[PDB]
Structure formats: C-alpha cells, structure tokens
C-alpha cells in the first residue's frame, strides 16, 4: 500500500555505497572533502529515486 520494493532496494544499494565511500581511505584533503560530500549526494539520489 505504501512500500515500493524498488525504491527500497535502491535504499539498501545507496546504504552499501555510502558505507563503501565512507570506508574509502584517502591522502588528499580535497579527497577527504569529497568523501564526505558524496555521502550527502548519495542520500539525495536516494530520495529522488524514491
């Protein structure tokens, strides 16, 4: 009635990918920055997909 299996699957997908971006070690400061900003963008794609 409310849950849509597709958007939910994409939720777990973005969950995995954000966990992976977060588990990505880097040297550069800017790479550290984008490592954070990508998690936000991931979360945003998640809502858009929903």
């Amino acid at each position: 009635t409310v849950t849509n299996e597709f958007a939910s699957r994409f939720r777990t997908i973005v969950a995995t990918l954000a966990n992976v971006v977060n588990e990505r070690a880097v040297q550069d400061d800017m790479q550290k920055a984008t490592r954070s900003c990508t998690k936000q963008w991931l979360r945003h794609l998640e809502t858009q997909f929903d």
């Binding site: 597709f6 699957r9 994409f10 997908i13 990918l17 992976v20 971006v21 990505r24 880097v26 790479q31 984008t34 490592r35 900003c37 990508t38 991931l42 794609l45």
Partner: protein, 50 residues
C-alpha cells in the same frame, strides 16, 4: 558499452559505479548484453578500492 575512462582515485568516482547499478536496474537486459565491458571498468574500481 561506450567506454568510460575512470581511474577511481577520487571518492566521487563512485558515481560511475552507481551509474552502472542504475543501468542494471532500469535496464537489466541491455545490461546483460554489455556486462563484461562493464566488468572491465568495475575491475579498475575493485583493484583501486578493494
């Protein structure tokens, strides 16, 4: 596959991975066709990330 040159240095490179995942979901068949040519990209991503 129209080829993608991605070294997967930046965390933002994860975009390309997601680009395939979406392609895998929205178009599973055409994906099955180009999947090895995707695997050539994803292997760079794996060797560089894991």
């Amino acid at each position: 596959l129209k080829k993608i040159a991605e070294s997967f240095e930046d965390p933002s490179s994860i975009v390309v991975v997601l680009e395939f995942i979406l392609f895998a979901l929205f178009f599973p068949t055409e994906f099955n066709r180009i999947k090895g040519d995707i695997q050539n990209v994803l292997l760079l991503f794996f060797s560089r990330w894991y």
